[PDB]
Amino acid sequence: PGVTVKDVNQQEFVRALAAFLKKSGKLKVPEWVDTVKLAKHKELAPYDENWFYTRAASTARHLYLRGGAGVGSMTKIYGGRQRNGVMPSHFSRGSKSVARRVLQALEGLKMVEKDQDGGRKLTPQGQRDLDRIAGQVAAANKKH
Amino acid sequence: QSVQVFGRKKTATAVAHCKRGNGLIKVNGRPLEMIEPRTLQYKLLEPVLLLGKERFAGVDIRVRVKGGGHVAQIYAIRQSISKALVAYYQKYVDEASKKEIKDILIQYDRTLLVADPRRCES
Amino acid sequence: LVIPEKFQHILRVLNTNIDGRRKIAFAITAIKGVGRRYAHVVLRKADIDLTKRAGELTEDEVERVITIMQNPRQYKIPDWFLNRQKDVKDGKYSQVLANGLDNKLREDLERLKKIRAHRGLRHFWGLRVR
Amino acid sequence: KVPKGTSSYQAEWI
Amino acid sequence: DIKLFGKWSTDDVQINDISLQDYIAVKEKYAKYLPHSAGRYAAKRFRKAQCPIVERLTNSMMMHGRNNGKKLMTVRIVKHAFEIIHLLTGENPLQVLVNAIINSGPREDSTRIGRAGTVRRQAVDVSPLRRVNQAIWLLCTGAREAAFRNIKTIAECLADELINAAKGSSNSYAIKKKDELERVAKSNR
Amino acid sequence: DKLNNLVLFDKATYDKLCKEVPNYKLITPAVVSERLKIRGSLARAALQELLSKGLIKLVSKHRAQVIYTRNT
Amino acid sequence: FTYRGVDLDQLLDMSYEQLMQLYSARQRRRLNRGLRRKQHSLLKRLRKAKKEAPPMEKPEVVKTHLRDMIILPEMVGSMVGVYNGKTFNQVEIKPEMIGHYLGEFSITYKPVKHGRPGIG
RNA sequence: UGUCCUACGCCGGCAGGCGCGGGUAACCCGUUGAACCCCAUUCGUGAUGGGGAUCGGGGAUUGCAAUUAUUCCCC
């Protein structure tokens, strides 16, 4: 029963983690998730109705893969093409408050621990949870 | 009891560490099927599909990759894995297996052992 | 999907013909003063699934979409999203609609001619303002 | 039709 | 055994015309797993004849400027077009590709002789390497104008052009252009 | 002339969908969109419905091209 | 007349920091930064010209080179000439145009009427 | 590249503000966590959801001063 998150399809791992967070029930969801835009370079609201859980799941997995990351690094990770009009396109960071409240909601789930180093890292119980969903996807992948 | 090789393409350098194992091929803590350009997947199974899992029975190989892009990293990965197997069969296996494997790989393609000397120019 | 009998080919909304065969969000976008962002948020606030087409909607859903579109603010649409934030006349956070844009554009233009500002005279000659 | 206080520099604007 | 995309056989491919046999490089040692190889093939003259012909078709598929560097897209489009060919015809799509290249390449062409002002052209023979190159170029161009503004995906249109050229019917762009070039050359002499 | 496509099915269109479609050997949204002048979104909806029903085999799923097969 | 739903009388009697909510961002930033001594001198000049006027007659014209003035509600009724680099333009200060600068009321250039082109 | 480059937290729809540390630099920015590209969703051949000019409103910084839109953000 020894499996690792790194030996799992990352996309399906994010989807399964989002499903686990959704059927978990308790999670701090802001009231403006249906009006927010996720970056200054993005154009529309996301098509997925429950994008917040997927974002929190991907955030938790990113803190698993490389910890010690703050809000600024998380905005650096999710940046993209700013289509500046007739101007040449550039690179722009994501929305700061969205990532900040994602981290605040996840530490409200006691899954993310504040660090003396300066950033944030993953709790050991959160690591156990991530290993449990990783084993779930491994079982649903190698047997199907 | 172990060997350490490198393989470069443009800028990407993949370092391969090979030892006595149980038939597992690992890169950056991820399985070889778990690298994000699955379109270019058969290029990185070319040593395995060319050579079979029978001679990869007791080999543990780890690859850590720095720099480059995506395609150059994949070519560095396959080159590093192949050089690791060749050096392992040099140091710990006989020489006839070495020349047989080298003949098969060279008659397949040349880039999988020798690196492209061309790089980005000023 | 199946054939809906109660399908409206053309919608008649707010002095505007709406192509009913289109998607709901972009059919609402087809009128003046509503873009894809505003149509998406007013449809999310109406608790309506976004995957449906415009013509195969019931009348109560259409009228409640029009109701939420007419008065945004007390239906929890925030006052940074609307078209006209501070009107010069009354200063009310108001989202204006197809006749409203043209009417208030004309009144802004005519008050700018009455002011005799540089922008109003530039509009009168008909040159670039920005 | 010229306003009361405007100058020729801006009377050509009107 | 080496199978293109892991499924497609190469030993069933037979060359009809022996003049193009030594240049259509698909058969035994030139069969690979993927069209992507990124080898130095234009370093010295006639080295591109050693190139696998699927790689040639892929490399002539990125020609237009907005797709001028993307190769993984071209190899997945080649894979999809081979799927479309296999479900339509039922044959080996490599055989269909080889037949299309054979039936697409012009055999003679007009050329200008004399000086600047000599507006009469002489008909000359066409090299086999040039014949293969121009056949690939015309097939890819037929795939381009076959799919500019339509619902049809370019993989489907590339498969349709390849099948129409392998059948030799008067529907492919390459077949029509080859017929026009040969008629012009026969008129000039 | 402009192309007019049905965003929703018709009775004759549904009759040609349930019967005349799953014997076309190869199935893509483009060919079913061009033979019957059907909008492509309705085309993928129809092909997904027929795959869920089980009358049409599936070869390939991708972001750009999806390839289906007539069953036997 | 009304301005953001506020009429002129309670515009005049209102204190200074509630006008720091009723303008645009530019005018609020300028008046929060603080007006220069020349602004304040012109302000005294305008209030002096307004108080020293007959009730039925319009005030005396005050000429200025200042183009960065923001029209506060205190100057409604002032008879002001603005320099545009060459000539003064005299204007009544109307109350619907408080949220603007003075310099845009004297245009500094002429509208271009194109003549017959020369050799080129 | 840097004594203006920014790490972290909080307030923020977002431009941005607030409290704090490092770096006169293979140390801190920075494993420079780049974009194309890849995989899934919606669109479906029409001035279209392509293309974004031109305009109408608000907000925030830079600067003695942005009215003749400095710049950036949001409908």
Side-chain angles (χ1 to χ4, degrees), chain A, chain B, chain C, chain D residues 2-14, chain E, chain F, chain G:
Chain A
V3 296
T4 316
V5 178
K6 277 199 169 185
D7 315 322
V8 177
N9 312 277
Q10 299 301 287
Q11 211 160 302
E12 294 295 325
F13 182 76
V14 172
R15 305 184 61 120
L17 197 60
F20 160 73
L21 282 175
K22 187 186 289 183
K23 273 75 71 177
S24 179
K26 62 93 175 179
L27 191 149
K28 181 69 176 177
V29 180
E31 53 199 293
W32 39 265
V33 297
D34 62 358
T35 65
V36 76
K37 188 182 283 185
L38 278 71
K40 72 144 180 163
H41 64 265
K42 281 164 199 185
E43 281 187 32
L44 281 83
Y47 293 100
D48 186 74
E49 299 286 324
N50 296 115
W51 61 269
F52 188 44
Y53 304 137
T54 61
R55 175 160 288 272
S58 178
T59 295
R61 201 208 83 221
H62 269 270
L63 273 295
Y64 184 107
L65 294 174
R66 171 174 155 85
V71 180
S73 178
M74 285 312 252
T75 52
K76 200 163 67 168
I77 282 152
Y78 285 49
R81 283 182 63 187
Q82 171 54 0
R83 297 273 295 282
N84 273 302
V86 287
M87 303 318 323
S89 298
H90 295 105
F91 166 68
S92 65
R93 275 161 173 121
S95 45
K96 196 186 291 181
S97 197
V98 169
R100 163 178 63 82
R101 281 206 78 72
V102 159
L103 286 152
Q104 275 175 221
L106 283 167
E107 66 183 1
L109 303 182
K110 64 90 176 179
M111 295 296 172
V112 170
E113 182 66 26
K114 293 293 291 295
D115 301 349
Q116 191 199 300
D117 292 331
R120 290 143 197 253
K121 76 181 188 170
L122 194 83
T123 61
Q125 183 66 41
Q127 187 172 2
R128 292 195 207 99
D129 287 304
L130 287 178
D131 284 13
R132 181 180 67 263
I133 295 89
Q136 273 205 31
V137 186
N141 183 72
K142 75 179 178 184
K143 206 176 184 178
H144 276 235
Chain B
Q1 47 205 311
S2 197
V3 293
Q4 184 79 284
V5 307
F6 82 105
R8 68 180 65 252
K9 180 67 182 294
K10 296 175 186 176
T11 300
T13 67
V15 169
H17 183 270
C18 166
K19 65 178 72 66
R20 275 70 174 175
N22 295 280
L24 73 164
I25 308 103
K26 182 64 70 177
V27 54
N28 294 115
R30 292 180 179 91
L32 265 292
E33 211 189 76
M34 295 296 172
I35 298 158
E36 59 98 21
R38 281 83 65 193
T39 304
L40 208 63
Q41 196 194 294
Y42 291 165
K43 289 297 291 182
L44 61 86
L45 282 72
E46 267 173 346
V48 185
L49 289 174
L50 259 55
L51 268 59
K53 65 183 181 293
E54 203 178 58
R55 68 180 65 251
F56 279 118
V59 188
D60 177 35
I61 178 65
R62 68 180 65 252
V63 176
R64 65 182 294 275
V65 182
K66 278 74 69 178
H70 292 120
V71 183
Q73 282 192 178
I74 296 295
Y75 284 167
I77 281 159
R78 55 193 283 271
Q79 179 179 178
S80 79
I81 283 166
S82 291
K83 293 182 183 293
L85 192 61
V86 167
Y88 174 72
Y89 273 51
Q90 177 173 5
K91 182 64 69 177
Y92 304 122
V93 187
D94 68 284
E95 184 65 26
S97 290
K98 184 177 179 180
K99 65 182 181 293
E100 203 259 340
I101 290 162
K102 291 177 70 68
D103 277 318
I104 288 160
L105 295 178
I106 293 300
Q107 294 294 321
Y108 187 77
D109 62 357
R110 59 88 174 173
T111 64
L112 183 145
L113 270 74
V114 297
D116 265 332
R118 58 178 178 175
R119 294 179 67 188
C120 186
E121 208 168 299
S122 181
Chain C
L1 183 62
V2 289
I3 306 164
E5 203 174 64
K6 204 189 174 183
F7 180 78
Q8 284 175 50
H9 199 83
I10 297 285
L11 273 74
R12 186 46 188 81
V13 167
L14 265 69
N15 205 355
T16 302
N17 290 321
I18 286 173
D19 189 40
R21 62 155 158 259
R22 277 200 93 207
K23 211 78 172 283
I24 49 173
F26 297 92
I28 298 299
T29 286
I31 63 170
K32 294 181 176 67
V34 174
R36 65 193 89 190
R37 196 71 170 84
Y38 194 69
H40 274 71
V41 65
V42 66
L43 265 50
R44 282 278 288 243
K45 288 286 163 213
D47 204 22
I48 295 166
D49 182 44
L50 277 296
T51 61
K52 296 183 290 294
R53 300 286 186 190
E56 61 87 20
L57 289 169
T58 53
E59 208 158 297
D60 54 351
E61 282 182 295
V62 170
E63 75 183 2
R64 72 185 180 180
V65 166
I66 301 299
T67 311
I68 296 152
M69 182 179 72
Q70 279 295 324
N71 78 132
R73 283 233 299 162
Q74 57 272 56
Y75 271 137
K76 280 73 176 175
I77 291 163
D79 47 358
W80 61 270
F81 198 112
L82 280 74
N83 213 354
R84 301 219 79 184
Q85 301 286 295
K86 284 177 184 181
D87 290 327
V88 185
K89 299 293 183 182
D90 62 358
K92 188 268 183 182
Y93 289 136
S94 185
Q95 172 58 253
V96 292
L97 274 300
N99 295 350
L101 275 75
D102 201 48
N103 293 315
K104 291 174 71 175
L105 180 66
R106 292 189 296 272
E107 71 88 20
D108 181 284
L109 282 176
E110 68 93 22
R111 71 174 289 274
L112 207 56
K113 279 73 176 175
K114 293 187 286 185
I115 281 162
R116 277 96 55 83
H118 175 258
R119 287 174 58 191
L121 294 174
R122 193 84 88 99
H123 272 287
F124 175 43
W125 292 97
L127 298 144
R128 303 289 187 200
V129 175
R130 284 172 170 86
Chain D
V2 178
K4 300 294 187 291
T6 184
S7 192
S8 308
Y9 207 89
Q10 201 156 356
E12 293 180 354
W13 269 100
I14 303 167
Chain E
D1 191 74
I2 295 167
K3 295 301 167 202
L4 182 72
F5 299 114
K7 61 177 70 67
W8 297 127
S9 68
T10 61
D11 307 304
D12 201 72
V13 190
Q14 72 70 15
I15 312 293
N16 189 359
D17 183 73
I18 62 170
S19 74
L20 301 184
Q21 184 178 2
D22 62 358
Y23 285 155
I24 299 163
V26 70
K27 180 68 176 177
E28 207 166 298
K29 203 198 81 179
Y30 294 146
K32 311 295 262 183
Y33 270 133
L34 273 171
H36 202 287
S37 79
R40 294 179 293 173
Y41 281 6
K44 188 268 183 182
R45 169 146 182 261
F46 287 110
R47 196 188 283 212
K48 60 172 161 193
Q50 302 304 288
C51 174
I53 201 69
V54 194
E55 181 152 65
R56 301 281 315 276
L57 186 79
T58 286
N59 284 343
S60 199
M61 189 81 165
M62 42 174 45
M63 295 299 291
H64 210 81
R66 58 193 181 95
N67 320 305
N68 216 357
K70 315 157 184 183
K71 200 166 174 188
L72 275 73
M73 182 179 72
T74 47
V75 306
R76 73 163 180 79
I77 296 169
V78 173
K79 181 186 177 196
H80 292 344
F82 280 175
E83 294 293 328
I84 305 292
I85 285 158
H86 180 71
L87 281 71
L88 294 174
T89 300
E91 286 173 47
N92 192 359
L94 280 79
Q95 183 63 75
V96 170
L97 175 47
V98 169
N99 287 359
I101 295 169
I102 283 164
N103 290 114
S104 169
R107 276 86 56 86
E108 73 173 17
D109 219 346
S110 298
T111 187
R112 293 176 292 173
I113 57 164
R115 65 184 182 272
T118 64
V119 291
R120 73 278 191 189
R121 306 185 72 186
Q122 192 197 106
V124 295
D125 300 324
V126 164
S127 314
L129 174 84
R130 161 153 202 83
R131 191 162 149 223
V132 176
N133 292 354
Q134 189 188 18
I136 296 161
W137 183 89
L138 288 155
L139 283 156
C140 282
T141 315
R144 297 180 193 275
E145 285 86 4
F148 188 48
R149 295 174 186 169
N150 50 357
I151 298 91
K152 290 166 68 67
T153 300
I154 63 170
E156 188 190 322
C157 294
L158 173 63
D160 291 331
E161 276 297 313
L162 278 181
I163 284 155
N164 268 315
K167 289 172 69 175
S169 64
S170 189
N171 297 334
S172 176
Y173 174 79
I175 296 289
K176 287 160 196 168
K177 285 265 277 177
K178 176 205 170 181
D179 286 14
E180 188 205 307
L181 260 66
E182 289 218 359
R183 190 268 303 277
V184 160
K186 275 221 281 171
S187 177
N188 293 331
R189 293 299 189 190
Chain F
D1 64 305
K2 290 182 182 183
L3 182 63
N4 284 266
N5 285 337
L6 284 88
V7 66
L8 294 173
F9 288 121
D10 200 50
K11 284 177 184 179
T13 316
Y14 187 73
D15 275 299
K16 296 183 289 294
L17 183 63
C18 203
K19 191 188 175 182
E20 291 291 328
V21 161
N23 48 23
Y24 282 165
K25 177 171 67 178
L26 187 153
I27 290 285
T28 61
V31 303
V32 70
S33 177
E34 285 177 348
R35 295 285 175 82
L36 303 173
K37 64 91 175 179
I38 298 171
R39 179 161 299 211
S41 57
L42 186 66
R44 288 168 322 292
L47 297 186
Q48 272 181 101
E49 201 172 304
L50 290 173
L51 179 62
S52 75
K53 282 180 180 177
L55 278 83
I56 281 162
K57 295 169 184 175
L58 161 70
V59 169
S60 189
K61 184 178 184 293
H62 196 264
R63 189 257 302 162
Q65 184 51 264
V66 298
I67 297 89
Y68 298 100
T69 307
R70 165 210 45 223
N71 208 299
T72 305
Chain G
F1 166 73
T2 186
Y3 176 78
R4 281 85 169 93
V6 178
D7 188 356
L8 186 65
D9 290 331
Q10 62 263 18
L11 284 171
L12 272 295
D13 60 42
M14 185 64 72
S15 73
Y16 189 80
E17 73 295 337
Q18 293 82 17
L19 275 296
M20 295 299 102
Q21 295 297 109
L22 292 172
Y23 289 167
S24 296
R26 188 93 275 172
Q27 282 78 23
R28 291 196 308 274
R29 177 179 179 80
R30 272 290 305 274
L31 301 188
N32 196 67
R33 275 207 162 215
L35 57 87
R36 193 69 172 88
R37 60 170 65 248
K38 184 59 67 182
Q39 267 74 13
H40 192 93
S41 66
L42 170 68
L43 199 81
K44 292 182 181 180
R45 202 146 51 105
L46 285 173
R47 78 170 71 252
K48 182 174 72 68
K50 185 183 286 185
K51 64 90 176 179
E52 207 191 65
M56 73 291 291
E57 291 279 78
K58 292 181 181 180
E60 186 64 30
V61 191
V62 171
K63 293 187 286 185
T64 185
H65 281 59
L66 279 149
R67 299 180 60 83
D68 81 350
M69 294 299 291
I70 296 169
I71 291 153
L72 297 160
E74 294 165 342
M75 283 74 74
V76 192
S78 313
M79 270 308 269
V80 186
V82 179
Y83 199 72
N84 63 5
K86 197 190 178 189
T87 316
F88 285 94
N89 185 11
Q90 189 275 330
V91 73
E92 181 65 26
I93 303 300
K94 283 181 216 93
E96 70 272 15
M97 65 182 180
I98 42 170
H100 295 87
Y101 285 88
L102 273 182
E104 67 164 32
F105 296 109
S106 299
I107 304 168
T108 49
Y109 63 88
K110 310 298 282 295
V112 169
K113 265 165 293 159
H114 273 293
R116 186 268 187 189
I119 193 66

